[PDB]
Nucleic acid binder design. Structure first.
Lengths: 52, 51
DNA sequence: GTATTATGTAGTCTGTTT
DNA sequence: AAACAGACTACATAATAC
């Protein structure tokens, strides 16, 4: 299922500050790009961080 | 058998610049610490970087 | 060495959910 | 309204790159 930004962060090898994760999203570092459902990002469970 | 700094670095989950790996060695971040043998560092196969 | 990039905390801004 | 989520910026330091 979709994860919240904090829930996706908590499953990564090195969780970061939520502001950091948000910056990754703004910078197109997350594949697939999270959808903003209303006020919050939804991450695919299989979303990964990529180097651009 | 020992590995070279380049060989060790290519085998990690995120290889870094040589400069950075050398700095980690200089800062004793790597265990077991590499042996300096002549001009090269020699890494144990099991050597990991401790955070 | 110096410069650039990555990260962190805060305040204020737009907008969403209750 | 009030709490929430996130954007954007100002301000920092650390790690990495040059």
């Amino acid at each position: 299922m979709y994860l919240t930004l904090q829930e996706w962060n908590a499953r990564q090898r090195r969780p970061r500050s939520l502001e950091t994760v948000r910056r990754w999203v703004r910078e197109s570092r997350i594949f697939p790009p999270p959808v903003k459902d209303g006020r919050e990002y939804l991450f695919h469970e299989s979303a990964v961080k990529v180097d651009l």
